[PDB]
Amino acid sequence: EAFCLEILGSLRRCLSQQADVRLMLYEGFYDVLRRNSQLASSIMETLLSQIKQYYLPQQDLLPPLKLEGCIMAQGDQIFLQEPLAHLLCCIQHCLAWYKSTVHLEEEDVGFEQNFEEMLESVTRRMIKSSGVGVKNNIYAIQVMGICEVLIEYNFKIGNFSKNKFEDVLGLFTCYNKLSEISFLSMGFVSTLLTALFRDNAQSHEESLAVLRSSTEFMRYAVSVALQKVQQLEEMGQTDGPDGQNPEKMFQNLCKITRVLLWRYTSIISLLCLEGLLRIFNTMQQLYAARIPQFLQALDITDGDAEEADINVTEKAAF
Amino acid sequence: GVFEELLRTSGIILKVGEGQNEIAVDQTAFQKKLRVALEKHPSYPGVVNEFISGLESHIKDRSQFKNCLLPCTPARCESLIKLLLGIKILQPAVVTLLLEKIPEFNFPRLIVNQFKWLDGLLDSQDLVKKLMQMLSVSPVPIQHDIITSLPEILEDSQQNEVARELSCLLKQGRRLTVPILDALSRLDLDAELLAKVRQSAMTIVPSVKLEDLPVVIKFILHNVKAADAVEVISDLRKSLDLSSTSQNCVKLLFDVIKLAVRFQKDVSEAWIKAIENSTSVSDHKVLDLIVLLLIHSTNSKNRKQTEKVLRSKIRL
Structure with missing residues (x-):
């Protein structure tokens, strides 16, 4: 061949x-x-x-x-x-x-x-x-940009590493210093990145709290999710690995919606507002059919109880 | 003397010439052959120079010249000069070889095929200076020959500058008109370098020949057709559009006018302003009616107002 x-x-x-x-x-x-x-x-x-x-x-x-x-x-x-x-x-x-x-x-x-x-x-x-x-x-x-990409490589490079996390902090402080003088290259390191931010914990409360404990990098995480959902919702498809195959988009969309929604509702909150508002617009006007599961994806644990009119009613309920 | 010793690297036969004595391996075989003799075994550079001379005894037999470009079963689609002819340390060396192949020479045009997307070399700028330099001693077949191959695939940093160098030389002849116009159909050696060169294009063919009509028309319209290049269209409509083998002349006029009629839409507005502005009323060209057959009638969706101006002066 x-x-x-x-x-x-x-x-x-x-x-x-x-x-x-x-x-x-x-x-x-x-x-x-x-x-x-x-x-x-x-x-x-x-x-x-x-x-x-x-x-x-x-x-x-x-x-x-x-x-x-x-x-x-x-x-x-x-x-x-x-x-x-x-x-x-x-x-x-x-x-x-x-x-x-x-x-x-x-x-x-x-x-x-x-x-x-x-x-x-x-x-x-x-x-x-x-x-x-x-x-x-x-x-x-x-x-x-090179700061953002290396930031993601490190950001997944260490499982619970406080050293990986420190270099995450360093890249982030460099990025903020780049703000002084943005279409982030953050395809899932800003999509499964926030899972620890709007999460609560697993083990490394010291690891995660040395990782995100700025409100500079926290703003960087929320802003990656915000810039991203918005680009998919209206501008076009997506940036990284999961634009063009929209099945990945719907899955990670349901997930990021779950986590961002939790960190908005339970707990800066203007960001969770602005992002869930842009996002629910993207979810009513992108996944028309897939919406039957996708709204259910935030409210359900297993889709074995109702249909989409049951979904319209019960999701409006929640 | 270590000619077939270079055959030790990945397989090179000292064939008679046109018989491409390949290796039964080519793609990394020639690089192995310029590592073994051309880099390691005979000498670091010395093996390269001695093997250059050692195959250079073969270079009077232009079978081993033109079999380089020719078809004959290589190591497993070229022969010696062309098939396995890539050295980055041999960049200036086979560049001197390209200068040596230049003067006697086509054979120099098959060496320009050997350049036709040549190996990405040590310095395209020294190469571009040399190529343009040994064109002033030879005929425009070699000039436009090497203009063709560099015209799309060339270094682009001194490439666009050397393009503007020839487009500063593009006045004195109508040779470089078409060859420029290919890489002035592909690209722009300068951004308004393109626009100034197309400023050359308007009077660039006022009374041009038949084929220079279709070629210089392809350049004089479709090279860089901006918005205001619509006015560009009007300029040409005044200059060379006195519409006259002859149908072949019509065929070239159509090739330009109609590869542009459905390439960029602006030529639709262009032929609209060519008639409706000041020609489809006052002092009409027969090419006005012909182009109306092409532009004012032959548009995909640029026809409704094409019919409006089509009967517009068609009524008054």
């Missing part, structure tokens, strides 16, 4: 060409190496060559990465990034997928190398107009 081999080898010449192709590739490498992804070896190989190429896994340097290039200054003063945010989020997602669930080519050797490079990116980031306004816009959008 020379199909996928010659096809990836043709789209290699889409590896860096004007930086719109770069954005769709950084989005779509993950989908190809997920669903039709028997051939994830060379896929991770292409990501690995690219990432450890423009970005640098060097030691003890100035910036955590080598942003100088990911910018329209990487052309002729033109504002075409070749976005480090794109390839960064793509690296973190598609590596998490291929490595951790793939055995649960660029995948494995890239796995060791990306482990080193990702621990480096965390420790080396958190460890610290008009004319050049090109530089400020491009550089800063990338800086805050």
Whole structure:
């Protein structure tokens, strides 16, 4: 089968060409190496060559990465990034997928190398107009963005780690400092992120309370959920792994609604208001049919007692 | 002398020429062959230079020149120069080889096929300077030849600048008109570099030939058709639209006018302003009626007011 081999080898010449192709590739490498992804070896190989190429896994340097290039200054003063945010989020997602669930080519050797490079990116980031306004816009959008993507990689990187959580805090404080001078790359690390925030506890009350105990990162979590539900509700489909296949959307929608609704109702609450209000609008006007379960998804534990007119009446009740 | 020694890497036969003595492996076999001799076994660079000369004894036999581009069963779709012809350390080396292939030469156009999306090399800017430089000693077949291949797939940082360099050279001939117009159909060597170049385009073909009519029309309209490029349409309607083999001339006029008639919709408004503004009333071209057959009658949904202006001066 020379199909996928010659096809990836043709789209290699889409590896860096004007930086719109770069954005769709950084989005779509993950989908190809997920669903039709028997051939994830060379896929991770292409990501690995690219990432450890423009970005640098060097030691003890100035910036955590080598942003100088990911910018329209990487052309002729033109504002075409070749976005480090794109390839960064793509690296973190598609590596998490291929490595951790793939055995649960660029995948494995890239796995060791990306482990080193990702621990480096965390420790080396958190460890610290008009004319050049090109530089400020491009550089800063990338800086805050790479912060968000690495934030998610860490945010799932540690099960109960206070060290993972500390680096979460550091990335978040960096992001807030990026606010001083946003379409977060937070597909489920801002969708199953908040499960601990609007949760109550499991074990690491010290871990979780060192993780979110700011109200800066708490605002970052609520704002990721808010920006996200809104983009799906009206703008279009979605940002990360779960836009285009709306079954994932409905499932995570029912879940995030459950948790955000709890943290609104029982307990800043203006945010839970503003988000559930945007969301219930998205749920009446996106899942028309699926609404029969989806409203039930917040109020039920198992859908074995009633129908949708029973659902209209009883959900209006609740 | 270590020519077939380079065959030790992944399989290269010292064939007679057109017989592509492949390896039974190609894709990483040639890179193995430029690692084994061209990097490790004979010398770091020295094996590269000696093997260059050692196959260079073969380079008088243009079977091993043109079998490089030709079809013959390779290692398992090219031959020696073309099939396994990729070296990043051999970037400037086979670049000097490209200069050496340039002067005698087509064969240089098959070397431009060998460039046709060439290997992503050490520096496209030195390559682009060299390619344009050895075109001023040779004919526009080699000029427009290498303009074709670089015209879409080229470095794009000095690429768009060198594009504007040739579009600053694009006045003196009508050679670079079509070759520019391909990558000035694909892209823009500058953003209003495109717009200034299309500012070249209006008088760029006032009394042009037959085929330069369809080509320079494809450029003079569809290169960068902005909103105000609708007025662009009007300019052309004044200049070269005196509508005249001959049906082939009509076929090229139609190729331009009708690949644009349903490509970008603005040409609909363009032919509307070409007639209805000041031609579909006062001093009409027969190409006015023809283009009305194309634009003013042949629109998908741009026909209702196409009928309104269609009978508009059709009534008065």
